[PDB]
């Protein structure tokens, strides 16, 4: 550190930031010189490790959207709704495998990193590059129609193996590419996978089951600790100033209906009970199922779910 500066000389050091260290970067580097007040260069940030394991797609991956809405109704069949969480918490459930060079890496990562923030790639949003990406290029031209890409987010290229990967920061979406702030330091040709990245944490440590000397199947579940912004759109049809659900439910699994009532106060003693209708109104309950078979339908369904906000918004 002690080294003279020549007059009219600018010495640009190379601040190399490693990958191993404490999670919270709380650094205060002091540039102290004689006859000058201390000029402390403060470096702040956080250290994260990305999840670089590909789960097999034999079993369907379950994505869960959960929100909180505590509703209280009076004696009459009238409901007031108090939707609590504006951004629903997203949970992912999937199964994976590890045989060659991934089992030991997975075990080490789980033992070391444990219950700490990850960088979970969005497996359902897999994407294949159409043209090779030159090393050092700024911007990845790829489809962004109905994808979980947000301005100032993260992206993670991947290769055949776990090691082949690299994470970059996306500035904005141009509807055809991903504006980047830092150039890519390694070129991957056509075939490399592109994954949107969202912060996630291990809700429960997976229970590893040994298949052979070096083989373990895990049921990993992840929860995202970042709001998932998404447009909220209702069905086009409108009736009495309200949305109308025109989608025809799938009949693959037989569905039934019921007439739920506030039929409490049965007042059963020993001789005979007697039920009184507090409101004398029946609120039907209906089930619904659907099949996407397309990106547009899935995006529309996600927008509908976000617009519903649980039980708050009716239709």
């Amino acid at each position: 550190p002690p080294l003279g500066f020549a007059a009219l000389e600018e010495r640009t050091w190379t601040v190399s930031i490693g990958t191993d260290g404490p999670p919270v970067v709380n650094a205060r580097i002091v540039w102290r010189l004689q006859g000058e007040p201390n000029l402390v260069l403060v470096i702040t940030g956080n250290r994260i490790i990305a999840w670089t394991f590909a789960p097999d797609w034999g079993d369907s991956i379950v994505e869960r959207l959960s929100a909180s809405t505590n509703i209280l109704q009076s004696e009459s069949a009238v409901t007031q709704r108090r939707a609590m969480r504006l951004a629903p918490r997203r949970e992912f459930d999937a199964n994976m495998y590890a045989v060659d060079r991934e089992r030991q890496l997975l075990d080490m990562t789980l033992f070391g990193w444990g219950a700490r923030i990850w960088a979970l790639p969005i497996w359902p949003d897999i994407q294949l590059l159409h043209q090779p990406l030159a090393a050092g290029s700024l911007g990845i031209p790829c489809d962004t129609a109905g994808l979980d890409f947000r301005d100032g987010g993260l992206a993670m290229l991947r290769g055949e193996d776990a090691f082949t990967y690299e994470v970059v920061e996306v500035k904005t979406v141009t509807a055809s590419g991903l504006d980047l702030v830092r150039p890519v330091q390694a070129a991957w040709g056509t075939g490399s996978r592109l994954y949107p990245v969202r912060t996630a944490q291990l809700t429960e440590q997976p229970t590893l089951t040994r298949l052979t000397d070096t083989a373990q199947s895990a049921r990993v579940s992840f929860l995202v600790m970042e709001p998932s912004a998404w447009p909220e759109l209702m069905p086009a049809t409108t009736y009495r100033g309200r949305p109308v659900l025109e989608q025809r439910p799938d009949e693959s699994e037989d569905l039934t209906s019921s007439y739920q009532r506030l039929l409490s106060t049965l007042d059963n003693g020993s001789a005979i009970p007697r039920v009184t209708d507090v409101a004398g109104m029946a609120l039907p309950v209906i089930g619904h199922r659907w099949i996407g078979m397309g990106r547009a339908e899935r995006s529309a369904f996600r927008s509908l779910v976000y617009a519903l906000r649980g039980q708050q918004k009716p239709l």
Binding site: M84, P227, Q312
Partner: protein, 272 residues
Amino acid sequence: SFNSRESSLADGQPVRLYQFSRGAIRWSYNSSDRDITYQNQIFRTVPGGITDNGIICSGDPQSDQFVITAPADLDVALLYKTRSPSDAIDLVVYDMHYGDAEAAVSWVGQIGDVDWPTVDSCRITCVSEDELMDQPGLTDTYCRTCTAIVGDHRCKVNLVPYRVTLTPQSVSAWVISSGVVAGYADGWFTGGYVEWQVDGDNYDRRFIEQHAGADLHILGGTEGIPAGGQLRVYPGCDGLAQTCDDKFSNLPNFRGFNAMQGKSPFDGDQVW
């Protein structure tokens, strides 16, 4: 629209805001997952969330407490970890709905107690101004001494001329020593208090057990006293009439009764 949203059956988006204020310093927190800007004030989002237990107004101060739950790393609560701040932290609670710029005031009070049951949480008990009515109100005794704290509204003595600003020479576990006070007679500062600036326009005060020569004895220890910070030290009044007039010449305002009567009734047994 706040009232309209409350009456609305489908736009309910409750969000509770807390404002901790101590003079010129304010701490803003919100219970949502994103920061909220209100009245040009942005409320930070606490990782883990901040939530209360409810508001009770039953007329009983002992029972109508307000409880706040927050992580153990909360900035405002962190101050109480070592020693309670001298001043009380006023707390104001607002209620607003996301997307609306109007909020309603719900609770107003000050910090009553703080504890850290778990490393991942902290519980704060907030008390209202009604609880300050449980202490007695006699505040009157026919004794010889002054029965008035030097500088109170009853003594009417200005302590600003007696203010002494100094930098301590050495600080120990229980004794703070300075040579400037060594020039005063023993016991000159006895009964006084030391105030110094902590942050902004807020000062922390400490009383003095005794003053002897160049050494000052601080009640409860000297922990939290900066070793090089500027300190303001005021004298103390013993309360005796001779002490009151010789030192401060405040005899006309002397609230004590030195020699009016000790026992003499007018319905006794024998006057002689």
